[PDB]
């Protein structure tokens, strides 16, 4: 469709299918959950009765005592040693089909356009690597929680936005569904949009 600009009011051409498709709630949710799971590292491990320090000696003989039958001090029902099902270090990453991942991005991009959370502008650069310049260039635009998605990574822009936490700068390649949804506004560049069109296809 046509993407209205706010500064040049220059027409932009974008494939209807990849920016006007319905919003697949179920597909987007599954991708977001998958992305969150992939972020984990599963760095957790416990010790079962086998791995607990101690010995296999029976604390007392197995009959005649007026006490319950015990086999070792490492039993899970015993203090200081146990854990019936000790955790192991495991990966929580989930496979997501390439088409499913691409389909989700198209749905999110379509939704953002509909909710006018996506703004297309011309080149967005800073003459010097100073955070003030970036802050001023956003205050006049009335943007507080924005994702500066640029066609090419620029060191001056990258350094300027590094300190700011509500402002994040990324390349088209470095985009994830979670970041796109989380950030209140996303401002693209003409080149960034063009490269998004082709690699989405």
């Amino acid at each position: 469709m046509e993407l209205v600009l706010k500064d040049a009011q220059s027409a932009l051409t974008v494939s209807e299918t990849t920016f006007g498709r319905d919003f697949n709630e179920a597909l987007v949710h599954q991708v977001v959950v998958a992305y969150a799971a992939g972020a984990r590292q599963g760095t957790r491990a416990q010790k079962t009765r086998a791995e607990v320090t101690g010995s296999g000696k029976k604390p007392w003989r197995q009959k005649g005592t007026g006490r319950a039958r015990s086999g070792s001090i490492k039993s899970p029902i015993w203090r200081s040693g146990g854990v019936t099902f000790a955790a192991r270090p495991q990966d929580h990453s989930q496979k997501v089909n390439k088409k499913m991942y691409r389909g989700a991005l198209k749905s999110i991009l379509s939704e953002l356009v509909r909710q006018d959370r996506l703004i297309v502008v011309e080149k967005f650069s800073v003459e010097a690597p100073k955070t003030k310049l970036l802050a001023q260039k956003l205050k006049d635009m009335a943007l507080e929680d924005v994702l500066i998605i640029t066609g090419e990574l620029d060191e001056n822009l990258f350094l300027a936005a590094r300190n700011l936490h509500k402002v994040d700068v990324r390349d088209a390649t470095g985009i994830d569904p979670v970041s796109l949804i989380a950030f209140d506004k996303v401002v693209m560049t003409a080149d960034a949009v063009k490269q998004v069109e082709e690699m989405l296809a």
Partner: peptide, 17 residues
């Protein structure tokens, strides 16, 4: 607070045979 270590052998039971 050590639990009793030495438990004596039980007294032999009366022969019910």
């Amino acid at each position: 607070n050590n639990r009793p270590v030495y438990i004596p052998r039980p007294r032999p039971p009366h022969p019910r045979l």
